[PDB]
Each structure stands twice: as C-alpha cells, then as structure tokens.
C-alpha cells in the first residue's frame, strides 16, 4: 500500500493550504488516515486523523484551523489548514494510522507517504537556470572525472536532480540548496565517472523544479 | 499531558558497535502505544518498531526494542553506515499523537581527504552577465575543512557560499561545494582563479586553479 500526497508548494501567506494523498494498493474505508508535518530541520508534529466513516480527531494546538476529509470513492483524503504563515513551512507527509482497524492491535503511523514541502511566502515562483559543469582536466584525477549542474535561480523549494534519467545513481552528489543574496536559491548536483567513458558515454542531469512546474535536461560535455 | 523525551541528543558510533536509544515518558505508557521510527536524509520517516518491541516487517533483526513504563529503548546490535539517520519515539494517549525530539546518529570513521576540482563558469552563464565558479571537495572526513578563493592570488571574502552533504549511506564521507559568484565584468578583469582546501586528511593545504583562457 503506497501513499502519495500532491498540493501546491507555495502559499501566500494568510491563505490557505489544501493537500490530498492518494492510496494505491490498499483501501480508505476501515483505516485511519493522519496528516504530519516536519519543519525544517526539525521534529514531527502528528497534525490530526480521519476514520472512513467520518470521524476526526485533531491535535490541540492546530485543531482551530485544521480540516480533514475523507473521499472514500477516489481512495483519497485531503487536509486544510487555514490562514498558513511563515510557521506553517514544513514537509506534510499522510500515513496510515495510527489506530488500528483491528480494534485490538497496536498503534502505529505505517504506511507513509513521500511528503511534500510547503513553503508560505509572498514571493513568486520562479524556474530554475540550468548550466552545465564541464569535465576539465581540472577535474580529473586518475581514471575518474567529475561533471555537474548548477541549478541558479529558483524559488522556493526544492529542486530535484537525476542523471541519464535515472540510469545513473552512483557518485552522485546534489547539495543543499541554499539562499543567494537575490532571494533565490541555487544547487549543485555532480556525479564522477569513468574519465575513459567521457569520449563514449553522454551524461545530462535532470532538472525538476515542481512548483515551477519546470524541467530541464542538460547535456554535460567536455 | 504526556510527553517524550529521546536521549541522547546525537550519538556518534564506527560500524560494528552498538547503539542504545534511549525514550523517556512524563509518565507511564500502554507498550502498545510506544513505536520507533527511522529517518534517513531528506525521506520519509519509517517504522521500524511498533508494540514497544515488535518489529515491522522487512526491518534488519540488528535492531530491537524494549523497555516499560517510562523508559523504552531502540537497540541496534552492530551499526552500520546505512544507519545513519534521526530515530524518533512516538506515543499516542488522550486522542494524541505525540514524538520525542529525536536522537542523530553519526558514524565515526578513519580520516578521508578530500579529492578537489574546479569549474570554470560555463559560456552560457557568461552570456548571461553573471559568472560561478565551482569548486568541489569530494568525498572525505571529518566534516571540518576551510576553503580560499584566490583572484589573481589574492584572497576574496563575502563572494562565495558553501554547502555539504549530509553523511553518505555507504563510505560515511561528506563532499563541500565553495561557489564564488561574479559579475561578468569582475570576472574579465582577471586570470588565475585558484582554490585553496585545507583539510585535516591533507599533509600540505591543496590548491586548485585554471586562467581564464583555456
């Protein structure tokens, strides 16, 4: 039973946000379904549950402003929580739980989903740039090359970088993204391979800016 | 209320030795109210034990939980670097939900040096009036390290920014990222680019660099 939330990612602050997961291989009706949230670089705060037939149950210090439903003919429950601030940017995850169908049986948030990251700010979104980190003999060193490519300029958060589609996994480095004097962020992502292989092989990243609904593909050369 | 308290803060441990997570509850707590869970680097947390001590399905016999009342405990018999992540306690009562803070779990590991290239600004960044340059130190430990640019062998400040990643699941390492941002204009009125990384794993500071006219 796999899970998956989707919603936007960018709420101006005030207003309010609406996030839905869809279950996949299992079923809504005689689970409960929780909402949580991780702020940045922080601890999980459980946001509150739905049963299928109806019932919720939210945490205290959200309860004024949170709403769960359920659409048990979609697979699907949606949360809302009303007039999002700054506080309010965190990664919302759905996880099934944490009561039991089974009246009698533990208490445990599983399954969860992928989480998605909901940052509240004014600013507008904006793609990213894509360049490319050419392999140099400045950036080799035996029989290994390394190559990337800078992610510039985009707003919020996050970016996601693969290579060759997702062929190529190994050696893989994409940093934290971090926050230019612009109010923009900006990433790197690099991968090392064989230095015999960059005459033969094509290496392109992958660029995925969701919020922006942006992608781009790089091609990598010498 | 009832609130959980995860001990300690951050652990540090080499493969091979045992990790024992502490939980502590502002009172007594229901064993099947008491789960485990595991958060590895920007993921999803998952279920590790449920039932105080049972655990889930398809998770490593390494780790096993126990403890009553107010002290239960997370156990991983040998670490290994696959298990570095954030490990949180989680307990529901009164029609609440609640987690501890979390214990970190780094691995400790023989010192790496780091392996250092450079990246001149592509020729489309140029085109667009703005100049990065990239300087990488891949894969070393420990996390400490210092890195200069130097214009023309002289030292910049407030131009460039860093970031690291988090530790690697399989070596353990950390690999930096140094970007020195220019103008275009800035950028032309000058040759050497060169970076300097002084590492603990270095015996003599290494500098990498390129002129502006490859």
């Known amino acids: 039973v796999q899970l998956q939330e989707s919603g936007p990612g960018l709420v101006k602050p005030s207003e309010t946000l609406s996030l839905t997961c869809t279950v996949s291989?299992?079923?809504?009706?005689?689970?409960?379904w929780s909402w949580i949230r991780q702020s940045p670089g922080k601890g999980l705060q459980w946001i509150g549950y739905?049963?299928?037939?109806?019932?919720?149950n939210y945490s205290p210090s959200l309860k004024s402003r949170v709403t769960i439903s359920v659409e048990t003919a979609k697979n699907q429950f949606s949360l809302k929580l009303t007039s999002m601030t700054a506080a309010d940017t965190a990664v919302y995850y759905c996880?099934?739980?944490?009561?039991?169908?089974?009246?009698?049986?533990?208490?445990?948030?599983?399954?969860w989903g992928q989480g998605t990251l909901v940052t509240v700010s004014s600013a507008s979104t904006k793609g990213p740039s894509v360049f490319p980190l050419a392999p140099s003999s400045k950036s080799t060193s035996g029989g290994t090359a390394a190559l990337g490519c800078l992610v510039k300029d985009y707003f919020p958060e996050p970016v996601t970088v693969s290579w060759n589609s997702g062929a190529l996994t190994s050696g893989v480095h994409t940093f934290p993204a971090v926050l230019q004097s612009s109010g923009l962020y900006s990433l790197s992502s690099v991968v090392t391979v064989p230095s015999s292989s960059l005459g033969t092989q094509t290496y392109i990243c992958n660029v995925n800016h969701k919020p922006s609904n942006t992608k781009v593909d790089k091609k990598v050369e010498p | 209320e009832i609130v959980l308290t995860q001990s300690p803060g951050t652990l540090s441990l080499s493969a091979g030795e045992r990790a024992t997570l502490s939980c502590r509850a502002s009172?007594?707590?229901?064993?099947?109210?008491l789960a485990w869970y595991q958060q590895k680097p920007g993921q999803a947390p998952r279920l590790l034990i449920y039932?105080?001590?049972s655990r889930a399905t398809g998770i490593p016999d390494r780790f096993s939980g126990s403890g009553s009342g107010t002290d239960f405990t997370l156990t991983i018999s040998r670490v290994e670097p696959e298990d570095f992540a954030v490990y949180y306690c989680?307990?529901?009562?009164?029609?609440?939900?609640?987690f501890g803070q979390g214990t970190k779990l780094e691995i400790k590991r023989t010192v790496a040096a780091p392996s250092v290239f450079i990246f001149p600004p592509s020729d489309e960044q140029l085109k667009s009036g703005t100049a990065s340059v990239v300087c990488l130190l891949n894969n070393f430990y420990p996390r400490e390290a210092k890195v200069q640019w130097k214009v023309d062998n002289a030292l910049q400040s407030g131009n460039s920014q860093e970031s690291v990643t988090e530790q690697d699941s399989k070596d353990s390492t950390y690999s930096l990222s140094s970007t020195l941002t220019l103008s275009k204009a800035d950028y032309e009125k000058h040759k050497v680019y060169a970076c300097e990384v002084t590492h603990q794993g270095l015996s003599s500071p290494v500098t990498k660099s390129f002129n502006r006219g490859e």
């Open positions: 996880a099934r739980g944490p009561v039991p169908a089974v009246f009698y049986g533990d208490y445990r948030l599983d399954p």
């Open positions: 291989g299992g079923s809504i009706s005689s689970h409960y």
């Open positions: 739905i049963y299928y037939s109806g019932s919720t």
């Open positions: 009172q007594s707590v229901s064993s099947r109210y």
């Open positions: 039932g105080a001590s």
């Open positions: 989680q307990q529901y009562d009164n029609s609440v939900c609640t």
